[PDB]
Symmetry: D2
Subunit: 480 residues, 4 copies
């Protein structure tokens, strides 16, 4: 047995009645319990994530099968058998916190590894490419996909406007409007790092790397009609499914694979290997197994752990570095920036975000300082040998720069249509049919000039793709 | 034609490419446009409302048909034909932004009248009673109804635990589990002030009042299966319907009716007229027509106007006062409290929240001061005749107190079951069948002791009600 | 030895150089250490206290000498020898955080007692009365005293305007413009609860109480000229002195005394005993020794402990209750209200604010949830015997109300001048001269009508007082 | 005459008395005016600036005397006679709001020019160099100079520790410890841009530039004894002086001069011309007159205009660009970053911060959206010709990069001591005496090892300088 108390630690005598002028009179201001309890209630909510607002989290373990020390000095990958705790959040993208998990969207696949040399965040999605290749466009892209700012309803005319005029999107759309646009749940789902990263070994040698997560539960997708039928009765079915698997002891897992490419292959290719609208051939750059992640524990409190979880692509660890991918570059900034707003200056002290590795630095203060700071020395350099010092063993690599000027200029070899055609042609006939069906349902109401431009983009990917879509939309494209 | 600019007013030379080391290198910190645009994007979201997070707004006009000056000095009600502008937000209650509008819930019905003596907010719901009668219980009620804090899924076993142990909820639950728990949309829906308020006339005479809104479009509800059919294909169907009606010129309207009761009728009733778990008889206190509200304009920007709208039951105008209702009393505090957090100290300067009536006072400063303040005098009393002064014509009434001590104690005559039985018996056979069906579906998985207590509460309301529910649940109540 | 790390726990290779395009080129975005370190720096500050911004804190112990159980059930006062930990902040009032401690002002004397039945805050000042007697006036008062909102400089013409038109201020001003308006430092200083409170014993019997702190170091003040001499060379002399005393083991101490008055003495007096512009006679209501507080430890971090400390007059413990004093009644609200803005919704989790007593309740979430919450049950009533429950042993008293209506009306027997005259007459001739000197320096530049009203208010206190001030100001009051 | 009103626009009947249970009873919760008024009071304060918290602002006009079109295409400098409105804030650096203006510190000299092509901020200080040359060190530098995080008192042992170990500081200290470390006020004070910037003309040709402001009132400084004398009687003498000059029509003015250097001069100098610890010889790069700024108008509200004013070095206009200076580079980030925290995401809508030039972009929402947004299109590219578009006439230059690799490495030719010696030797004998006096008073209580290192640093600047300091400190440096 325990007393109900105020936040001052005073036991509460009555948690049923406000203090009033007799049993039926108006309420008095001197009711600390009422005021404190209402005021805290009044302040429960914090801003939702600007994208990926809807999601679900779980803890688990990653275990190395094949050590990667020949390619990366990353401590958590250094030895067979080595286990690292993780926290993972899965999500949709566009709609708000309470929105259904049956909508078409990429799914987020955000892993925080609690390594002995710091937290490593790999902030992936299920689909392995993106719509755009420069972060400057992200707010535009998002605003086009988001509910209309007048009506609060998503409008395909808006996002198809932006996407058609951003033809690098063509490959992504070709995946998003397959039925993999609606994964059956979070467990039966791919994961991808999307970007190329740099792995740097103890000798300072660099490779390009791509990450891939392969579900032990297999990949399964929903048709539009299957998604609708689930939506009718459950708007949180993927959150449900994840919690339930774990509660039952049926732990979902993914095998981690990487591809590795020499920096010097840039000139051997007809696309930029750091363009995130591109994949790398699995034939030319085969998948190499690293290990397995198993999710085996639900959080204790959804708000404190899942809703307040903060992941950033810039939470890198020694031996793993950003590539020059311009989309990735902006992310390095935007996540910690949004997290300071959403969660507070000290969000890194929220338990789920805390490293296992020691934190020692000269940062101080900020809202909600709860860590019991002490000491006179909050600056470096200083004269004290016992105060924290830099450690040059942990310097990052020095990538070579090929440019001689500060420029704003698109990459060379953008090659916006080729891989979209290759993906189209890789689909089974059933999959192609589902693609055309999903695209047609989405495009049929949009502005005619935009609709034509969409058809033309997919035609450039593959003539059959474009012609089928034109036919299904009742657009005559003879004349182009 | 317009230039795209930064917030500094500098025209943007390139809104496509980040600034980089050559055409494919890493990104530079000196890209003010990139950083300003990402940083503002990163800060678009603010906290959703703690309850009623999902909703939709519209503007319109209220016109008086019968002047109410005999009963209230309220300026906006003073004469036939008088028109006052309104803003109205409709909502669900429990689930977040983005959640479907097909869920079972009260609906919010919040009206802001822009009067010549200040803004008057009548912050209603569709249903005319509430689950509880003291604001001290509101965070408890809400937390039981809200998604489980571990699973993020709503759990009937949790809110039924609370409700069964809070038998004053029995009347409300008898309305909420009729099909009126799922209105067809926001236009074909009842509105209620719920609480008794006080109307005070120019002679200082007070009457108790209840407000009622009657839809010109009729009341229409959804069965569970009708709601599921809509939910399959649209999770924002009520927001859609409202916008579309107005955009088409098919303006929805509601007639405003009041009931009026002498203060002296308290003592002879077998309930407390200021208990918000009670209605008043429409035979004994007939509905009296006041006027009509027509909604005829969608907002220009959903965030700025609908999301940032702030209503409070304490936004009262001369001639309309709070009653002693202990649930109302807390609301008077909680709304402007939460709004300071959700919207900022200066939320009353956000355009939708601004009065039409002049605002002059000695308040100052606060986050986001945008009003161009001036003058040396921000204190009263002062020696300056031209500075704002109090006006004793606008004093509120002096309600009589019946109590002689500061107490925490339940009202007399709580009478938790009688009106629930009267409501049950007023249902058609089809409506009773739907009630029992909706209750059974909700209760069938809850803890057996809780399920029994629920049955017993509805049995006390009406023996046929309780026995039918026991039967439908397969629960043997013989030994009770 | 320790590595300097990021907040992710990654050791920092170089804490001297930003990452750049060669050794002299512009800076890259991909510099997580730079951006994290600057972004946290950029957010170090929180709002200062709206008043009492400048202050200093220390920890100590309070020890009971005479148990008070005959008069109050307060646990921390229950036994001779009983020790309770404290945290104390001393302060000036009007000017901002970095302002000098040599200015004229009341001094704050805020004591947080970490009791076994919760935190008790006695939020006092040095001077034993106040300017005003209703919280509605506090923003006005403060705005008049604060730097002019145009010039950022305090103007006596502004606060004398207010004070002269608020004649209840006369007693306070008679103490404030003695040399006790500038204490020599925070150790050689009086402390007062100011308000009357209610003490309730285990039988439910109530007495009125007044609290007084008497410094072991004696009371010592500065003249205007002595204060200027200190200010020339140190603008934080009192903060310095407190820290230095404690660091060198010269712990400052205060003896706590109370006065006790029956509720039934209200009619026996020519002032309202809950008017905080009044003191109680030490002859008629003798000082009774309670115990001693010794301050013996400086904080480890000033921001985390002193700057983030939150005290409230509403942090009452069983056996100690508010009186009806209308100034105190507003304070009960204002302190936790401002603290939620200044410090966050979860400010009660910041270590210095945490109780020693257990905290268990159903509150949740809010910015910066750092406490590792768990469990499914966040609502009461509930079916679970082990969850926290109310404890009726801890109900507060039920004060009798003498009013029969809700009114806005000044107290009876305001008696604004009598005690001011008594205080004036209690001064030595030297002290009277210092009072007249200090008043004259302050009033000599103000508006002539205001200056005459000030003279008239002090005349009504005592004719000699008024006449001396009129003489010193060159104002002829013979015509009146 | 005006009514005092609530923020709802309801006239207030009584601004003196809270609502209570009879004339002396406790206070009621149903007192919207009391609560609204206390709650806004409770929220008046925002965080102070992390540095330069103490300051004062004024408006004025800048007039071009000599067009600068040979060297920059900046619109505001394009024609003789062209007038641009400005807002200017002057400040100290280290201590909080409220702190004295008689302390040793650089002073801030921040000018916002409201140009036809956007707001241009030149965020200067009086002294023309800085302590450090990389932004990564700024929080360290500041934390060393700030009050000790334990004692809340500035400690020379702390900042001398940092500075001695940061020998690039030697030139700055040789200025700061002249009497120019304490300007007499803000009007009789130098201004400097400190950094090298880039000026780009209509042909795309670039020069390096430095900015200098020369007071029409002449430069005047305070000795330590003069500063103490002012501090005794006034802790805000500079804020007072600036206001008072303007109020009386004695407008202070500064002439703007520039120095111009070819980019190609880098390679021939024995220092880096973008090292902000360095000045450029006025013999080799003569001062060239641009125009004059006159400050002629005080703000109407200090909080809304001066306290909320936001300047950034990244508020550049066409023809004026950042240089590669690594200290400047980090400022480009830090200012808008802190401002979003201190002021809100929408701080650029606060009136003092608004451009005169039109703002049109696709940003949206954020706390306190007051600007009445409208329209369906908040994304680019889009199909609408009338929506805002990029304008390639306004592209910035493409600076050449001399580096091969992303590196963390000190600039070449740091040359930490030469210019410090030159400055020393340029002082009059009186000025050298004052320098040594001021240094000696600061260093005499510092740790011996630190004190010796300081002496050594100044000795390397100039043997006489170091030896005089050592002699004054009683340190025998013969052995070295
Ligand atoms: C320039 C491109 C992008 C920008 C600017 C961007 C920005 C953001 C921001 C601001 C958030 C909210 C973060 C938070 O509140 O902590 C977010 C969430 C997220 N984004 Fe992105 N994003 C971009 C591209 C991508 C890409 C390529 C992926 C996947 C490869 C991705 C996956 C995610 C995921 C999974 C989340 C949710 C993380 C979580 O579960 O907590 N985004 N993004
Ligand atoms: C990396 C070096 C520096 C950093 C990181 C930095 C950072 C900051 C920050 C965060 C502020 C607060 C701004 C606000 O809240 O609006 C500030 C204020 C200021 N700093 Fe710096 N600063 C640096 C160097 C300098 C330099 C070299 C100068 C002058 C040349 C300078 C002059 C100022 C001034 C004048 C202000 C006051 C602006 C105002 O009146 O609002 N700072 N600094
Ligand atoms: Cl922020
Ligand atoms: Cl650090
Ligand atoms: Cl006011
Ligand atoms: Cl708040
Ligand atoms: Cl609670
Ligand atoms: Cl934009
Ligand atoms: Na009439
Ligand atoms: Na005793």
């Amino acid at each position: 047995h325990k007393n109900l108390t105020t936040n001052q630690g005073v036991p509460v005598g009555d948690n049923q009645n406000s203090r009033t002028a007799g049993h039926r009179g108006p309420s008095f201001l001197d009711d600390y319990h009422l005021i404190e309890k209402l005021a805290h209630f009044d302040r429960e909510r914090i801003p939702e994530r600007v994208v990926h607002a809807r999601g679900a989290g779980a803890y688990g373990v990653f275990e190395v099968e094949n050590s990667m020390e020949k390619h990366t000095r990353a401590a958590f990958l250094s030895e067979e058998g080595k286990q690292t705790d993780v926290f993972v959040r899965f999500s949709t993208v566009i709609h708000p916190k309470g929105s259904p998990e049956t909508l078409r969207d990429p799914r987020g696949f955000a892993v925080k590894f609690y390594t002995e040399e710091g937290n490593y965040d790999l902030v992936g999605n299920n689909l392995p490419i993106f719509f755009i290749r420069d972060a400057l466009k992200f707010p535009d892209m998002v605003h086009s996909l988001k509910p209309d700012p007048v009506t609060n309803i998503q409008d395909p005319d808006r996002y198809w406007d932006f996407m058609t005029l951003t033809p690098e999107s063509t490959h992504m759309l070709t995946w998003l409007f397959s039925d993999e646009g609606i994964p059956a749940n979070y467990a039966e789902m791919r994961g991808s790092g999307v970007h190329t990263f740099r792995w740097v070994n103890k000798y300072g040698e660099t490779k390009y790397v791509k990450y891939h997560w392969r579900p032990s539960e297999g990949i399964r997708n929903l048709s539009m009609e299957e998604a609708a039928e689930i939506q009718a009765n459950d708007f949180q079915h993927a959150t449900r499914d994840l919690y339930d698997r774990i509660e039952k002891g049926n732990y979902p897992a993914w095998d981690l694979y990487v591809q590795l490419m020499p920096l010097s292959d840039y000139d051997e290719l007809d696309y930029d290997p750091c363009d995130p609208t591109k994949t790398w051939s699995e034939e030319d750059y085969p998948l190499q197994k690293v290990g397995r992640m198993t999710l085996n524990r639900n959080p204790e409190n959804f708000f404190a752990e899942t809703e307040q979880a903060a992941f950033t692509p810039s939470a890198l660890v020694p031996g793993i570095e950003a590539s020059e991918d311009k989309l990735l570059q902006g992310r390095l900034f935007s996540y910690p920036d949004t997290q300071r707003h959403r969660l507070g200056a000290n969000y890194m002290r929220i338990p789920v975000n805390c490293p296992y590795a020691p934190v020692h630095n000269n940062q101080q203060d900020g809202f909600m300082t709860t860590t019991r700071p002490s000491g006179h020395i909050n600056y470096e350099p200083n004269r004290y040998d016992d105060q924290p010092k830099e450690n040059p063993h942990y310097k990052e690599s020095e990538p070579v720069l090929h440019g001689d000027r500060m420029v704003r200029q698109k990459i060379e070899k953008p090659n916006d249509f080729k891989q979209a055609g290759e993906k189209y042609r890789s689909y089974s006939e059933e999959e192609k049919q589902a693609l055309i069906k999903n695209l047609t349902a989405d495009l049929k109401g949009v502005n005619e000039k935009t609709k034509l431009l969409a058809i033309c983009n997919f035609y450039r990917a593959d003539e059959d793709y474009g012609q089928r879509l034109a036919d299904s939309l009742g657009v005559d494209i003879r004349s182009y």
